[PDB]
Design a protein around this ligand. Sequence first.
Ligand code: CDC
Ligand code: CDC
Lengths: 140, 140
Amino acid sequence: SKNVVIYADGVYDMLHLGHMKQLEQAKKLFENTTLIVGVTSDNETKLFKGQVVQTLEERTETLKHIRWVDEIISPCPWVVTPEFLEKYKIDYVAHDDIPYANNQKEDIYAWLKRAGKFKATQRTEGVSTTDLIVRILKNY
Amino acid sequence: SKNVVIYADGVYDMLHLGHMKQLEQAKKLFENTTLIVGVTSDNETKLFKGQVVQTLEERTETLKHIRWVDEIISPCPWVVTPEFLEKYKIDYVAHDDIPYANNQKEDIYAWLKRAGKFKATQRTEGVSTTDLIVRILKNY
Ligand SMILES: C[N+](C)(C)CCOP(=O)([O-])OP(=O)(O)OC[C@H]1O[C@@H](n2ccc(N)nc2=O)[C@H](O)[C@@H]1O
Ligand SMILES: C[N+](C)(C)CCOP(=O)([O-])OP(=O)(O)OC[C@H]1O[C@@H](n2ccc(N)nc2=O)[C@H](O)[C@@H]1O
């Protein structure tokens, strides 16, 4: 079976079980794959989404320890472009199907879905690190 | 080159970059290895070391997402025994060389070092999750 290149981009801040299960999902979209993972720059993340906890260096080094990750682009661009897919020869982009707004686009993954190049992944809730301190705030 | 079986046991609570680098170290002790990772039971950990944050189920599922881990024993025994090595055909046990007391033994890894069956790993400090909330406690 031919090898399919999947691109999962994210902030991947303070990596937790939900991200791990997503990367596993992406990696496992086709029998034979290369999972490329893009990590967002500290500047852009703080500019578009909000406060990041770990630096690009820290978020990128952890991804290096995860079984499903084949290559990392660090830092990665914010909006996937068609020129970006040809450059890294990506066949599919993987992320959750919840639309992801920009400021000029409502979805940012829209064109990938219309082109067939979007493989939706699912989220794991309640397993975040912030959620675990909330759990620790049950011994006091 | 023959395959060497390495056994790294730990609590592995709230897995962080130090544990990842240790497991990478153990896995990479010999060109060809099987890394077995033992995870300590919730009861025993709370009984010998102290309060654990995540449950055995939670600590074990994360280890499943780490590139260097080949097999998991969950739960694992507290003190490595000679019968335990023959059972899982472990050639070497990996952990930091800091002696690890019991209540009746001063080191617990002592006999493995005297027998040559101990491969020391190094720690990574300052990268723990508790350390990262301390870092977050710099925006208020
Ligand atoms: C536009 N980008 C790509 C530059 C940034 C978008 O990336 P993000 O904002 O989705 O960042 P993120 O790190 O929260 O998500 C990374 C990946 O983990 C998945 N994720 C996140 C949290 C969670 N509980 N479960 C998951 O499966 C998200 O669906 C996403 O596919
Ligand atoms: C006697 N046991 C084996 C049952 C429990 C001993 O295991 P532990 O108490 O060392 O638990 P732990 O989870 O803190 O350590 C797991 C592994 O990660 C390594 N570790 C831990 C913290 C850190 N900053 N750097 C590391 O390299 C430790 O040396 C150990 O080799």
